[PDB]
Design a protein around this ligand. Structure first.
Ligand SMILES: [Mg+2]
Ligand SMILES: [Mg+2]
Ligand SMILES: [Mg+2]
Ligand SMILES: [Mg+2]
Ligand SMILES: [Mg+2]
Ligand SMILES: [Mg+2]
Ligand SMILES: [Mg+2]
Ligand SMILES: [Mg+2]
Ligand SMILES: [Mg+2]
Ligand SMILES: [Mg+2]
Ligand SMILES: [Mg+2]
Ligand SMILES: [Mg+2]
Ligand SMILES: [Mg+2]
Ligand SMILES: [Mg+2]
Ligand SMILES: [Mg+2]
Ligand SMILES: [Mg+2]
Ligand SMILES: [Mg+2]
Ligand SMILES: [Mg+2]
Ligand SMILES: [Mg+2]
Ligand SMILES: [Mg+2]
Ligand SMILES: [Mg+2]
Ligand SMILES: [Mg+2]
Ligand SMILES: [Mg+2]
Ligand SMILES: [Mg+2]
Ligand SMILES: [Mg+2]
Ligand SMILES: [Mg+2]
Ligand SMILES: [Mg+2]
Ligand SMILES: [Mg+2]
Ligand SMILES: [Mg+2]
Ligand SMILES: [Mg+2]
Ligand SMILES: [Mg+2]
Ligand SMILES: [Mg+2]
Ligand SMILES: [Mg+2]
Ligand SMILES: [Mg+2]
Ligand SMILES: [Mg+2]
Ligand SMILES: [Mg+2]
Ligand SMILES: [Mg+2]
Ligand SMILES: [Mg+2]
Ligand SMILES: [Mg+2]
Ligand SMILES: [Mg+2]
Ligand SMILES: [Mg+2]
Ligand SMILES: [Mg+2]
Ligand SMILES: [Mg+2]
Ligand SMILES: [Mg+2]
Ligand SMILES: [Mg+2]
Ligand SMILES: [Mg+2]
Ligand SMILES: [Mg+2]
Ligand SMILES: [Mg+2]
Ligand SMILES: [Mg+2]
Ligand SMILES: [Mg+2]
Ligand SMILES: [Mg+2]
Ligand SMILES: [Mg+2]
Ligand SMILES: [Mg+2]
Ligand SMILES: [Mg+2]
Ligand SMILES: [Mg+2]
Ligand SMILES: [Mg+2]
Ligand SMILES: [Mg+2]
Ligand SMILES: [Mg+2]
Ligand SMILES: [Mg+2]
Ligand SMILES: [Mg+2]
Ligand SMILES: [Mg+2]
Ligand SMILES: [Mg+2]
Ligand SMILES: [Mg+2]
Ligand SMILES: [Mg+2]
Ligand SMILES: [Mg+2]
Ligand SMILES: [Mg+2]
Ligand SMILES: [Mg+2]
Ligand SMILES: [Mg+2]
Ligand SMILES: [Mg+2]
Ligand SMILES: [Mg+2]
Ligand SMILES: [Mg+2]
Ligand SMILES: [Mg+2]
Ligand SMILES: [Mg+2]
Ligand SMILES: [Mg+2]
Ligand SMILES: [Mg+2]
Ligand SMILES: [Mg+2]
Ligand SMILES: [Mg+2]
Ligand SMILES: [Mg+2]
Ligand SMILES: [Mg+2]
Ligand SMILES: [Mg+2]
Ligand SMILES: [Mg+2]
Ligand SMILES: [Mg+2]
Ligand SMILES: [Mg+2]
Ligand SMILES: [Mg+2]
Ligand SMILES: [Mg+2]
Ligand SMILES: [Mg+2]
Ligand SMILES: [Mg+2]
Ligand SMILES: [Mg+2]
Lengths: 127, 205, 260
RNA sequence: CGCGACCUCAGAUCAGACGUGGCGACCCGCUGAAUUUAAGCAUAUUAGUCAGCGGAGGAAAAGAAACUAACCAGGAUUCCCUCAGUAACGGCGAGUGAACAGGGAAGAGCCCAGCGCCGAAUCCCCGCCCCGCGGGGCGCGGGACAUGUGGCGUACGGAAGACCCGCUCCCCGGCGCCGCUCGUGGGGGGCCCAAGUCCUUCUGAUCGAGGCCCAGCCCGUGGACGGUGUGAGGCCGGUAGCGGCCCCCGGCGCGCGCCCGGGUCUUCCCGGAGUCGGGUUGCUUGGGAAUGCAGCCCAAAGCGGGUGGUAAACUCCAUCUAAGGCUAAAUACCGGCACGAGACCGAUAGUCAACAAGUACCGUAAGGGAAAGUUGAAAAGAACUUUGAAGAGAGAGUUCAAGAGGGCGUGAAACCGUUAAGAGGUAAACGGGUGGGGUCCGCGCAGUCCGCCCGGAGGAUUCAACCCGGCGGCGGGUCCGGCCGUGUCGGCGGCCCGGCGGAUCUUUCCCGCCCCCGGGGUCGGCGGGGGACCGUCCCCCGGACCGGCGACCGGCCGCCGC
RNA sequence: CGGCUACCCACCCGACCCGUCUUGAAACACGGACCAAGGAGUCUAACACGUGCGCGAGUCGGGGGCUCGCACGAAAGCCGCCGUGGCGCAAUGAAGGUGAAGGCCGGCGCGCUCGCCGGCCGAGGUGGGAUCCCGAGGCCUCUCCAGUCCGCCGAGGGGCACCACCGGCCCGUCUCGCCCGCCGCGCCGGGGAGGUGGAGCACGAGCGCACGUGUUAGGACCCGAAAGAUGGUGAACUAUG
RNA sequence: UAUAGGGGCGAAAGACUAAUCGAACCAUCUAGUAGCUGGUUCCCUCCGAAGUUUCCCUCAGGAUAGCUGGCGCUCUCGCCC
RNA sequence: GAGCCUUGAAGCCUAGGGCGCGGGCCCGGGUGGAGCCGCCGCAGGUGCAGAUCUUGGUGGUAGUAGCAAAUAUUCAAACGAGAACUUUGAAGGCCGAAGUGGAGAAGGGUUCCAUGUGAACAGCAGUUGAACAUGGGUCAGUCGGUCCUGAGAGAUGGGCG
RNA sequence: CGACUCUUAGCGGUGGAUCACUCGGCUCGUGCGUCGAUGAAGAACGCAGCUAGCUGCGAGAAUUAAUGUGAAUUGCAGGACACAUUGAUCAUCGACACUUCGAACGCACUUGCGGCCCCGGGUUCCUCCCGGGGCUACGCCUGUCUGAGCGUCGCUU
């Protein structure tokens, strides 16, 4: 139950801050869960997604055994796009399909020095 | 406009009272503000007690409320001089000083002096340097408390004289009748006219 | 409202220009100029009886009636039929009002609290609250209240040692104190007989805080228990007692209908 | 005639510094109506308000009595409840309308002009040095202010000067650092638990049942939001004196700078002026023989002046010391910056404005002032063929759905078109009564009713009839074996190893005191403490009643499934 | 086969188009082309009455305070040497002021159109008055005997609520009369008997809460004016230099 | 360019003063007041009037009484009077 | 109420079935796609036929009145799907120097010019325009403002408030 | 037989009522106390690759520098794809910058007309000569400089 009086249980204010949040807040909102082997190996529950993360889709029209790599992350639309998931238009031109990043299981992460610092902070705060 | 049998009313609502409406919607707000003010005072100020300066035993000027007692304002400089301490030294001790309050009653004088002696007995002070004037060792483990509540020595002290047992007595019961009040009233109403008639009797030889 | 719909300045036409006698906003170009002004029957108009901030909202109750309602609610929480007719599941539950030990109030982990409710068979009453956690009916979903969560048991205690932590996120449960008895929590919705779970110190402090009909309450200064209107109130026992049936006329069960 | 000093002055684009204007919800100062009421209207009420004008601050104003009272006297200002719709004002009509107590919130007091004493021991500016990081402030040398009066000591509560007594020796402003603090000081960034497990539908699922005898898992975290719909676990976030870093503010502790109060006696000083008050006149007030303010005139006193609610004279008493000034507190805030909540509204409602709203537009101008939300989960916004110059259409295609195709959710009424049925000279329409036609509903139409008992015909089963074995309840008696309920005495036993109340007591008890002759006297008086007695609860055995919703066990008659 | 029916049609009879102002509407009286949405007795304060609840000669915390920092908590619980205070328990007067108990028995002063002492009872009497109590008497298959039993009642008594009257007490005026007391003998106080006016007493029923009706002030059931005041904007039309 | 609202200007019509002039326009007081027109929103059941006395600067209005409704209370009968 | 449901809630339509005298309600069939209801108490901005009611939409009138102030058009060709209206040749007329002409002050602000489209506006129409979209166009010592005073408006000194 | 008119039902067309949602209002309360001569509020003009409005900015103009976070903004081409160099975007912003009018300040405001000082080139110099920078409003306070007085006085011709 909410106890701090400096945060809202208010639907209008939460939807306002959600649909008008800046991009550094939208990066924290667009976060994806991890696979069971990667969370067993790293001891971390959730991570933000980036351009070169490999993605297995768990829900939607396409489900499972589709370990592909994302290409674009529209934070304005709250939608990542996956190279494996395609759909043809009327004129035979392919186009990516809108997938929300909360229905996304990450199987591989991109390694970077900043991501090692992030993973160290995750493991230290999880303790 | 009026009607059947009812009381004649003169409501004072002809003036534009709609603009000036003050309704206590912030009454629990002021309650929480003043709780926080009292608690922040007890935190920040001192181990001085709440309602810091001590108030005197004071009678209320009326024919109505003079049977009761009251916590006054200050200790009435003649009383403080009989108690024998300096004015601002008393203000730093905790004595409330009001220079306006006079003294007509020796009884109230001695009552406030004994109240000051009791306060001086209950006083425990702590200076900064350990040269120890008016102190000593750890007096009652820093006096067992930090802050008193609602007056230090219970400033009401409604004294209760009883006089429960006495035997029926001599002709006071035959002399203190209703006629004494009427005779005193007539004497007070005709005091000066008898003096004028005595002056005229001395004038007319 | 507090700010009028009289922001639009307007005048009425009168006899000529026979549209109406209602005031009309005056101007040109804008097609609002000539429409309905302030008034109740007009578009964009000030409402009839604008709700004011000086309405008599809050209602004072006598303290004797407050304590009377607390005593009546606590008395109605003892009978099994009243609480079963209110709807708590008291099938596998042991004896009425439950008195738990003083080791209950020192709980910190709520797994022990869930285990205690399962062993005391209040888990059915919690499971009813689990089964009914539906969505709010109507337009009340906009003002941040979107859950119909029914009330379950309440645990009344003193000397808090973590019992609010152990009983804080159970659905349907109610935090309640001995020295602060709430009518709105002991009988929500004005319906008496809520299932309650007491502690040893609570169940002994009730007799200290209200008393019997012999002595007064020792914590409350000027309170006594109410006068009992009908002492032995079994109406079937009274009407079937021999003292009443000694002085009855006769059982008259003839009908004497209409004779054609 | 000239030079010099003071005083009244001017000048500058001299050096340095200051005011203008905005906002104006709250606050201060001025002045300022009428609509309305009085059923008419002048006094009155609306109102010392709307409007107008001048100012500042987060509060403002007020604020240390020229006070209230009239008795066993209180004692700065402000805010609330009462006083009180009272005293009182009013064509005493309508109406208007306080204050002192008293209970609470908060409570902090002071300074200067005069009187005098200190050789102006006082302040501003200029120039160089002592000086420290993020910067200006003590001290050195000469130019001014000021004797027509700086500062120190002083303030009506008395103060000062000189002896006597006895002690005290002292604080406010800097600077480096250690551990904290009641939310665990302020703000910001970033991080913190637990299913996405098999079946099932669905376009999508967050739907639906279950996860071993330990309840699949977490909870100090089941608030809320988005996510293809209804989630505590899938994601920000939610609980936690949960955990880490950076920035700022406070009180501890080395240098520099200043530093005599109290009691007795003697002497001396002791106050605010066109101000009070009086006459007269306007506004205001509840203030009336004038509450306050202001204009004009007359205009003080020093055992004085003011107040003491009825004008005046005489007399007595109480209280205060006006014509100089400062100060946080409780109080107000429809302006502003950020924040949270709602028994409120839900696109004709709610602010005029959910949207490129004070926008489009109108008037020369002051000013007036709108209409207007919704495709779908995703644009995947209909490729391609074909008629037409195109608008548009017929196929095909996407989507769960074009019956969602660009103001595109749902799609009613008024109105119109077409189809189907019926009718048509007294305009149409209606009520009562039927008849005809049509849509539709239920039923099987010369065959549809059921539940029980008994006399008949075959099969298949085992109780029941009686008892043994067994558990659970109903009912009363010995109230037997023990608990508990109501009143009665008793041990006064927990009265000192008890709870509460008593303007019922004990001056042979104690302490702090007063009186009369260091001691004595209950000789008398006050407060506090100990206990004597009264009015309800805690034990016990003995008795009475009910065994009463307070029930355990044994036995008895009669139920009960296996 | 049956079916009432917001379907259609025909036939017999009756049938003027609703709302209001009005004695009178179908009116040659007024509003109404049609349809969808909005639209008119609310709220505050005060009073009165009725009702329900709690306490009840008391009642009420609305003003503050106490709890640890809790979403619901702007809730709720408590104060009691916080009852200050509002209303009620006492009224009458303009006011100084005064202020609601009488009755019975015995004794005395000439039981005198007259006061005192001792004891007792205690809010008076009359006529009604729900109810209640006592009870002559009567009645249950054959005789004396009986207890509760079936079982009413002439008459009698005590008399709630209230009604009608009389009498009594308190206060202010009016009339007539005598006495008592001295912290001081006076243009000092008090008392007696009658007739009066009062919103009085004559065993008190109020306080708080909530609902309903009615009235009043507030915009106040909704809409409506000719008018007045305050402050600003216009001589680009027109009038005159 | 000057005269700006009880003001201006007027060879004078009370004519003109931004389509408005026997007192302009805009906003505020203001939702001014009206004894005066119009309207006033679901059903059923029960009871059910008056246009009259008196008074008022009263005659289109109001107060009082009457007529009416609601809420009750006190009793009476069910068992030769 | 272990209420209802994406195996379809609210809303709407309905020659369907029914209940209650009535306010209204329940079920059947169809569009629709995400919230709704029964009982007990509580609180209302709670029920429409009218108010020359306010807002919005739509009929009869009605394909009706009306597209008639200023003498008037006609043939052929061309661009064009399409010509009574666009352009050119030719014929006939009007304005007739107080113009239906050539340029300005005020006022308009891109309307000026070229190209392309013709849904939209031009009261019929368009291939046309002052419509729409795109791209261009205003060059000063000697033209005017700037300088000067005119009627007048105005600040300091001063006075009033 | 048809045409026209009326009443129901289906479907279609104008219409946007009802229902569902709300990045919106309204109320209440808490926290803070903040504008400007060092140029406030407000207004005009300008700024994006394609850019009318709103929004955001001021010739450094869709933002500059710095801190924090950490791989993008996006409708489209381009551009830095670097991250064992310096790092895109976003928020904070404490450092720089802030056209003109505006209390508006050299005058009134017609973007006009000046007056001083300094710096660069123009006859290498003022003499009403081009560009750039600084100053130039009123009132008033303290101090400095100058001089007006038959206001008062001293010494002297
Ligand atoms: Mg909100
Ligand atoms: Mg009436
Ligand atoms: Mg008014
Ligand atoms: Mg208003
Ligand atoms: Mg207005
Ligand atoms: Mg509105
Ligand atoms: Mg609804
Ligand atoms: Mg100002
Ligand atoms: Mg009138
Ligand atoms: Mg009038
Ligand atoms: Mg007045
Ligand atoms: Mg004003
Ligand atoms: Mg300020
Ligand atoms: Mg002051
Ligand atoms: Mg003083
Ligand atoms: Mg009163
Ligand atoms: Mg007067
Ligand atoms: Mg009156
Ligand atoms: Mg007044
Ligand atoms: Mg959700
Ligand atoms: Mg959720
Ligand atoms: Mg998580
Ligand atoms: Mg004096
Ligand atoms: Mg005098
Ligand atoms: Mg005097
Ligand atoms: Mg006197
Ligand atoms: Mg007097
Ligand atoms: Mg003063
Ligand atoms: Mg203050
Ligand atoms: Mg809508
Ligand atoms: Mg609108
Ligand atoms: Mg969408
Ligand atoms: Mg569908
Ligand atoms: Mg649609
Ligand atoms: Mg649809
Ligand atoms: Mg036909
Ligand atoms: Mg009539
Ligand atoms: Mg007539
Ligand atoms: Mg009619
Ligand atoms: Mg007519
Ligand atoms: Mg009509
Ligand atoms: Mg009509
Ligand atoms: Mg409606
Ligand atoms: Mg009552
Ligand atoms: Mg009292
Ligand atoms: Mg007038
Ligand atoms: Mg004026
Ligand atoms: Mg002109
Ligand atoms: Mg003329
Ligand atoms: Mg004339
Ligand atoms: Mg004339
Ligand atoms: Mg005109
Ligand atoms: Mg006129
Ligand atoms: Mg006028
Ligand atoms: Mg009105
Ligand atoms: Mg009006
Ligand atoms: Mg009459
Ligand atoms: Mg009439
Ligand atoms: Mg009447
Ligand atoms: Mg009656
Ligand atoms: Mg009746
Ligand atoms: Mg939807
Ligand atoms: Mg219903
Ligand atoms: Mg309404
Ligand atoms: Mg509502
Ligand atoms: Mg209607
Ligand atoms: Mg009607
Ligand atoms: Mg109409
Ligand atoms: Mg209309
Ligand atoms: Mg519309
Ligand atoms: Mg039409
Ligand atoms: Mg025609
Ligand atoms: Mg023409
Ligand atoms: Mg051709
Ligand atoms: Mg051709
Ligand atoms: Mg032609
Ligand atoms: Mg031609
Ligand atoms: Mg010409
Ligand atoms: Mg052109
Ligand atoms: Mg056309
Ligand atoms: Mg063309
Ligand atoms: Mg154009
Ligand atoms: Mg040239
Ligand atoms: Mg020229
Ligand atoms: Mg002037
Ligand atoms: Mg001047
Ligand atoms: Mg940068
Ligand atoms: Mg320059």
């Amino acid at each position: 139950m909410k106890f701090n009086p400096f945060v809202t249980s208010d639907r209008s204010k939460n939807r306002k801050r959600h649909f008008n949040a800046p991009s550094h807040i939208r990066r924290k909102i667009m976060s994806s869960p991890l696979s069971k082997e990667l969370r067993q190996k790293y001891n971390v529950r959730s991570m933000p997604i980036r351009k070169d993360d490999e993605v297995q889709v768990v829900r939607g029209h396409y489900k499972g055994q589709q370990i592909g790599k994302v290409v674009q992350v529209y934070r304005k639309k709250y939608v990542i796009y996956i190279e494996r998931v395609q759909r043809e238009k009327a004129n035979g031109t392919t186009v990516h399909v809108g997938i929300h990043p909360s229905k996304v299981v990450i199987t591989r992460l991109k390694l970077d020095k900043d991501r090692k610092k992030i993973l160290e902070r995750k493991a230290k705060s999880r303790q | 406009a009026p009607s059947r049998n009812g009381m004649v009313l003169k409501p004072h609502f002809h003036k534009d009272w709609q603009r000036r409406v003050a309704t206590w919607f912030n009454q629990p707000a002021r309650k929480i503000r003043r709780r926080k003010a009292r608690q922040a005072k007890a935190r920040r100020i001192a181990p001085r007690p709440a309602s810091g300066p001590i108030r005197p035993i004071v009678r209320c000027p009326t024919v109505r409320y003079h049977t009761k007692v009251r916590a006054g304002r200050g200790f009435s400089l003649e009383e403080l001089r009989v108690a024998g301490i300096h004015k601002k030294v008393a203000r730093t001790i905790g004595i409330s000083v009001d220079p306006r309050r006079r003294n007509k009653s020796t009884e109230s004088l001695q009552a406030n002096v004994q109240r000051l002696k009791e306060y001086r007995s209950k006083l425990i002070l702590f200076p900064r340097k350990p040269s120890a004037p008016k102190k000593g060792d750890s007096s009652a483990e820093e006096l067992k408390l930090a802050t008193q509540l609602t007056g230090p020595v219970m400033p009401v002290r409604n004294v209760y004289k009883k006089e429960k047992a006495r035997v029926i007595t001599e002709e006071e019961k035959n002399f203190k009748a209703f006629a004494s009040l009427r005779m005193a009233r007539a004497n007070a109403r005709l005091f000066g006219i008898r003096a004028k008639r005595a002056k005229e009797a001395a004038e007319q030889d | 409202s507090e700010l009028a719909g009289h922001q639009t300045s307007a005048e009425s036409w009168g006899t000529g220009r026979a549209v109406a006698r209602i005031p009309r906003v005056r101007g040109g170009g804008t097609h609002r100029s000539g429409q309905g002004a302030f008034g109740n029957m007009c578009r964009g108009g000030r409402m009839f009886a604008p709700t004011k901030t000086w309405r008599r909202w809050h209602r004072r109750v006598n303290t004797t009636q407050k304590r009377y309602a607390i005593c009546s609610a606590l008395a109605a929480s003892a009978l099994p039929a009243l609480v079963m007719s209110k709807g708590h599941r008291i099938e596998e539950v042991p004896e009425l009002p439950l008195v738990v030990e003083d080791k209950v109030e020192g709980y910190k982990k709520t797994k022990e609290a869930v285990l205690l409710l399962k062993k005391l068979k209040a888990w059915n009453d919690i499971k009813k609250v689990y089964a009914s956690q539906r969505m709010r009916a109507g337009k009340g979903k906009m003002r941040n209240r979107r859950r119909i969560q029914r009330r379950g048991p309440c645990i009344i205690y003193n000397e808090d040692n973590g019992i609010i932590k152990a009983f804080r996120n159970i659905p349907g449960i109610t935090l309640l104190n001995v020295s602060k008895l709430n009518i709105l929590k002991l009988a929500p919705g004005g319906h008496v007989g809520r299932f309650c779970i007491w502690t040893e110190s609570a169940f002994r402090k009730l007799d200290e805080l209200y008393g019997t009909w012999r002595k007064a309450a020792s914590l409350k200064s000027n309170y006594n228990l109410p006068m009992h209107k009908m002492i032995n109130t079994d109406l079937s026992r009274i009407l079937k007692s021999p003292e009443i049936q000694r002085a009855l006329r006769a059982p008259r069960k003839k009908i004497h209908r209409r004779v054609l």
